[PDB]
Amino acid sequence: EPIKIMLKPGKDGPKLRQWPLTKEKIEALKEICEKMEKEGQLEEAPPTNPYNTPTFAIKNKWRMLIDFRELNKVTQDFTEIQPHPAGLAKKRRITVLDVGDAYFSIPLHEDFRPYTAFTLPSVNNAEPGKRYIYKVLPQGWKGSPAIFQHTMRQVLEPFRKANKDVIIIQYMDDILIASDRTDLEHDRVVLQLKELLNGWMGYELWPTKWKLQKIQLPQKEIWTVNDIQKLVGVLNWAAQLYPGIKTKHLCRLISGKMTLTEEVQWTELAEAELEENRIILSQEQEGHYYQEEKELEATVQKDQDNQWTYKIHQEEKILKVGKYAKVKNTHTNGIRLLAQVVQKIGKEALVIWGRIPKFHLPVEREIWEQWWDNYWQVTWIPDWDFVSTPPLVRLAFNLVGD
Amino acid sequence: AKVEPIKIMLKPGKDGPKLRQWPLTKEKIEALKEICEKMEKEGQLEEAPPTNPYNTPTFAIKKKDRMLIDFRELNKVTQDFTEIQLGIPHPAGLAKKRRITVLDVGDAYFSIPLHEDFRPYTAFTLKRYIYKVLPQGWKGSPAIFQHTMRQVLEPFRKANKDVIIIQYMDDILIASDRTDLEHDRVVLQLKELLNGLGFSTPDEKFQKDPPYHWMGYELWPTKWKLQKIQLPQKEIWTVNDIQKLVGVLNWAAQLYPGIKTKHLCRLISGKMTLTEEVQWTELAEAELEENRIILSQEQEGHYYQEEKELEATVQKDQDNQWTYKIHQEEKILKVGKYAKVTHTNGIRLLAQVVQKIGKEALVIWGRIPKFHLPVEREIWEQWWDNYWQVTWIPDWDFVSTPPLVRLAFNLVGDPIPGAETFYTDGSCNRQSKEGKAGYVTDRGKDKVKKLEQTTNQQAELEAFAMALTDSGPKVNIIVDSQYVMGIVASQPTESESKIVNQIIEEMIKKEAIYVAWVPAHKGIGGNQEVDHLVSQGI
């Protein structure tokens, strides 16, 4: 029998709008839900059900992606699910599988089902929305992996003992198979595991192939007034994030100079200050400041050199910085690029910290919310808000490298 | 042939209505009992058990050519339902088909049974009655009706996969490419299905030939047309009149932008009799007037051919005026506008237009059109390539639809050799709003300007302007305001601000401008001296 589920005190179910989709996605969605209903996993929602969660389709045949972020915020408990073995990041290869279909074998308590309502739109609003609610654990709900743990445990626990070298952990609707085996021995473990589940839609990661990058101060043969002005600027940006960063002596170098092209005459104080700052940045970026008790955040922005970069942080504490290679296709969609960067960052964060960050995106809310789904290939959806990139941050992130 | 009615609830911690039954004339009570007589007869009404404590005010109104129950309180306590269809079909998305037929369901609500446990709350006194069917004016009636109709038509639609059935409220449009004989035959099949499930289809509400009146539109065989929407112009406005008015406006606001119903609703601030004269407010008055203007328009276009391409052509008109046309080859499906509004440029606005059109096209055609834009590719790509913010752009084409969107900015990435360097800054007295804006240059010059009723930001901008104004065709400018820096980076071409406009004016004359920022109050050469210069006495 299904366990009783509760909404947090004073909270009600989701009452969100369904976004318009292409004709092909609508057709694919209706087909998916028809089968699901026929299989007893969904049932039509009555006009008396006032809730609604937005549905999407990702891709080949389509997969339904219901955005249960709001319902997850309002669901009581299941907090301790968003447990992590730091060895994972050291593994040579990690295979991620979407195991959400498995959830459909476990029923959902009849009292919670109405909150899972979703609507399938129709082109030109030719007909009213087709509404459904779940009768079983829904993919995308935080409670599903938790309620499915026993069923999953009955399979993975045995297989884990038989392969103590491989790391098999689950995060939401994902299952990560990580190991140092040769590809054929790895693909082998993966196929085995899939055979056990059946009683596909996933991807590959090569953690040990990821180059660690850091903020690095410029090094020039000859520094000009402009060069020092630019340096002090980014040093001022860093002083807000890193403790101990100073610029008094570097500023003093140009206190009596206004011509941007003029070369500065170095002092021991300035040199020792620039060196101290290099050591601080280097030493502090090799530290460990994570706090699984505070929200994991990621802010994305474009370099002043127009490359995509990001910083993983918690408030002002930066845990990691990265920079992706410049894109050739000059006429690529902006929303597409950003969406690829976001998914790469999340995948990387999953391995490293075991959870998806809340993203702060350099995009207008309305444009992002309307198109993000056309370029999405993973089964998770992070929380995100929208921000503006300050000119200085663009210069600051030009320093990520190595 | 019985399907059990859906179960309904009241909002938690709430109870049905027990309101005052206001006595009315003898003539009235005569017509009313007559109405209820027939409704109880036909099965819409039933008599309330002696234990029913609930009651809702009943009214009689002079035939709009008579009974009106005030379910305002019952609605307030009834649970919430799902709004199963917000969005109206648009004829521009209707595929061009050989035959079309339009028909309405008569007394739609009368055919839908209200759940036994919920009828108690519908009680009203005249003798006392309760509803057995969905009551007109009750909150759940349209949600339940809409839901019921979808299920009645679903089997019909899957039996005739080639026929286009579009249902909105009690209006059904049927279109197909079958023979005149076959089409009429399938329409008769539909009426048989409905009548058999208890839904009447008045012969009078049936429409054989064009033009077809459908949801405010007039469908001709070749093109569609949105008629001017006329709004009631009564002498004395009752609460009920405002209600119906707001109803129409709710629909109309999906066909036109700028429709407001706020101040109009504040006129019927709850508990007031349904017959009570409204107290016109100036803002309510203004709202209706603007609404009448807006709706006194008209639109037209052609029908969709899914096999052919879907295109979108944009053209900038006067100043903030952007217009577009969705078309297939030379056939125009529908035309549109966008003039939405501090400091952007044509490329950023163009992108907003593209977003608007894209969203609209997903809704109407389920597909993204091919865009033809008045902007050169190198210009477009270059700008978005450098900009910090990302935007949506599907495949598109450049089209010489003068005037073209062009950005002409000479912002360079490194200091300009030999060019004079200006250090900019502006102060403001927090309490007197008196400030100063000035500059100092590496060539020895400096200038300060006293400002009144200014602001830090404004002073900062006025200073940047001064530097641009007093410099050659090539200039380096160092500011200490990330604000000014952000604005210059966004290379604006239009603004409401007067100073920002001068800044833009001056910036276009420059061959090259190098603009960088330095932190303030750090004793940085140049910056420190302007800072002191403009802060003196401020």
Curated annotation (Swiss-Prot), chain A:
A motif (Tryptophan repeat motif) lies at residues 368-384. Residues 200-206 are annotated as: RT 'primer grip'. Mg(2+) 1 binds at D98, D173, D174. The record marks W371, W384 as: Essential for RT p66/p51 heterodimerization. Residues 39-205 form the Reverse transcriptase domain. Coiled coil: none annotated. Transmembrane segments: none annotated. This is p51 RT. The chain holds residues 618 to 1043 of 1464 of the full protein.
UniProtKB/Swiss-Prot annotation, chain B:
It is found in: Virion. It comes from Human immunodeficiency virus type 2 subtype A (isolate ROD). Residues 42-219 form the Reverse transcriptase domain. Multifunctional enzyme that converts the viral RNA genome into dsDNA in the cytoplasm, shortly after virus entry into the cell. This enzyme displays a DNA polymerase activity that can copy either DNA or RNA templates, and a ribonuclease H (RNase H) activity that cleaves the RNA strand of RNA-DNA heteroduplexes in a partially processive 3' to 5' endonucleasic mode. Conversion of viral genomic RNA into dsDNA requires many steps. A tRNA(3)-Lys binds to the primer-binding site (PBS) situated at the 5'-end of the viral RNA. The record marks W383, W396 as: Essential for RT p66/p51 heterodimerization. Heterodimer of p66 RT and p51 RT (RT p66/p51). Heterodimerization of RT is essential for DNA polymerase activity. The overall folding of the subdomains is similar in p66 RT and p51 RT but the spatial arrangements of the subdomains are dramatically different. Residues 212-220 are annotated as: RT 'primer grip'. The lineage of its organism: Viruses, Riboviria, Pararnavirae, Artverviricota, Revtraviricetes. Mg(2+) 2 binds at D425, E460, D480, D531. Residues 416-538 form the RNase H type-1 domain. Mg(2+) 1 binds at D104, D170, D171. Transmembrane segments: none annotated. RT is structured in five subdomains: finger, palm, thumb, connection and RNase H. Within the palm subdomain, the 'primer grip' region is thought to be involved in the positioning of the primer terminus for accommodating the incoming nucleotide. The RNase H domain stabilizes the association of RT with primer-template. The tryptophan repeat motif is involved in RT p66/p51 dimerization. A motif (Tryptophan repeat motif) lies at residues 380-396. This is Reverse transcriptase/ribonuclease H. Error-prone enzyme that lacks a proof-reading function. High mutations rate is a direct consequence of this characteristic. RT also displays frequent template switching leading to high recombination rate. Recombination mostly occurs between homologous regions of the two copackaged RNA genomes. If these two RNA molecules derive from different viral strains, reverse transcription will give rise to highly recombinated proviral DNAs. The record marks F422, Y423 as: Cleavage.
